[PDB]
């Protein structure tokens, strides 16, 4: 519930489905930790990542693995992937959405924050 | 000098060539005027609009042709055009840009106004 | 069920609450006939616009008043409204989601057509 | 000439100025090696990044420290930075544009690859 990614094709007008995405946070030695991961649904969302417990305060960093899914509709993209990083929880617990908009030489991706 | 256009495509990665712009001014009984069009460039970019004696405070609306720029590319697109309205206004700066980047679903636009 | 408005603020990080949207179809002789209007919820989203029996095949403009949402929140912008304009149902009924992320200087739109 | 960065102000219509921007190649073991930095111009661009010689096919990053850019306009950001990863690969267009357009909690990114 705190923390699902959405994202959209800008060529189909559609949910981009089946997009991978992982998560990582920044550990204490500067490197990044393995968070969570998962794929897009049919809706082109992804919910389940984490829970309240688990995301903690931290700089975490979302990984839209965008090269795949273009490749995989016969465009051969330009970037490797989105990439979303941004500190969390450090307020307190909020429920973030992170959107990615994507095109095979661009992208847009958004943050939306809600207080619970 | 004060209103440039420029067109990018999303799905190329590259200016948008030929694309049909007309720029129109809101008229006092509401009605848009014809002001200025032509074609973008190679570069994507369309000058010589207008002059600074001519483009005076008011509203404005680029059309920007999409649907024909994806049709001549054999790609089917969503929307008719891209309609950009604003107010020009001499207390800002005194150049404006008015930049797209289109996809077939989905259209981004920006002014970028300096001095 | 047929046609659904959503806004974002990208200044907030948040739904774009109370933004007034106005629907127009082209008519026969070319002019721009009312076709409904509404508010953005709490959610940024504006459902009830329409039915399906009403949406019929045409040319729609939604006309997202962006200039007072910018104002009322000490932004004198530079849009007076964003205009999206399509042709819908020509191949039979669709459902089309009308997003738009805002900013004050600048706006981007994407449309979700999904065949139910 | 083979690389440039741009960076657009959505809030403030316009360029933005200042902006450190960091270019690093991805290295055979995985690790981001620095390239090329700089700073935005007045224009909100970067040249002056690579030569044709040194910027050959492979893995590159682009980070752009978005988070100061906001921090020093009194505005507090959503991002920590915004990064753009790409390939460079010379089948394609020779000259790479890669483009950013700031809002405080989005951001969008085109390359614009031309000859
Ligand atoms: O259009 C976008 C967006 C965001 C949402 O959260 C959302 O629910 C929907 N939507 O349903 O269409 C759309 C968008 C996404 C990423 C970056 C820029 C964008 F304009
Ligand atoms: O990417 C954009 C943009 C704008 C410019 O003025 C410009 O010179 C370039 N560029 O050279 O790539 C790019 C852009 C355009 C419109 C709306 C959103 C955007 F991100």
Same mark, same amino acid.
């Not at 699902?4 to 995405?21: C, E, F, H, T, Y």
């Not at 649904?41 to 899914?69: A, C, M, N, Q, R």
């Given at each position: 519930?705190?923390?699902?990614?959405?994202?959209?094709?800008?060529?189909?007008?559609?949910?981009?489905?089946?997009?991978?995405?992982?998560?990582?946070?920044?550990?204490?030695?500067?490197?990044?930790?393995? +968070?969570?991961?998962?794929?897009?649904?049919?809706?082109?969302?992804?919910?389940?990542?984490?829970?309240?417990?688990? +995301?903690?305060?931290?700089? #975490?960093?979302?990984?839209?693995?965008?090269?795949? #899914?273009?490749?995989?509709?016969?465009?051969?993209? +330009?970037?490797?992937?989105?990439?979303?990083? +941004?500190?969390?929880?450090?307020?307190?617990?909020?429920?973030?959405?992170?959107?990615?908009?994507?095109?095979?030489?661009?992208?847009?991706?958004?943050?939306?924050?809600?207080?619970?």
């Amino acid at each position: 519930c705190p923390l699902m990614v959405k994202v959209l094709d800008a060529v189909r007008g559609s949910p981009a489905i089946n997009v991978a995405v992982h998560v990582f946070r920044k550990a204490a030695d500067d490197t990044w930790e393995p +968070f969570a991961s998962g794929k897009t649904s049919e809706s082109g969302e992804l919910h389940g990542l984490t829970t309240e417990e688990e +995301f903690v305060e931290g700089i #975490y960093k979302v990984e839209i693995d965008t090269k795949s #899914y273009w490749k995989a509709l016969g465009i051969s993209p +330009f970037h490797e992937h989105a990439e979303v990083v +941004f500190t969390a929880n450090d307020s307190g617990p909020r429920r973030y959405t992170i959107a990615a908009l994507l095109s095979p030489y661009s992208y847009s991706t958004t943050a939306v924050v809600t207080n619970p």
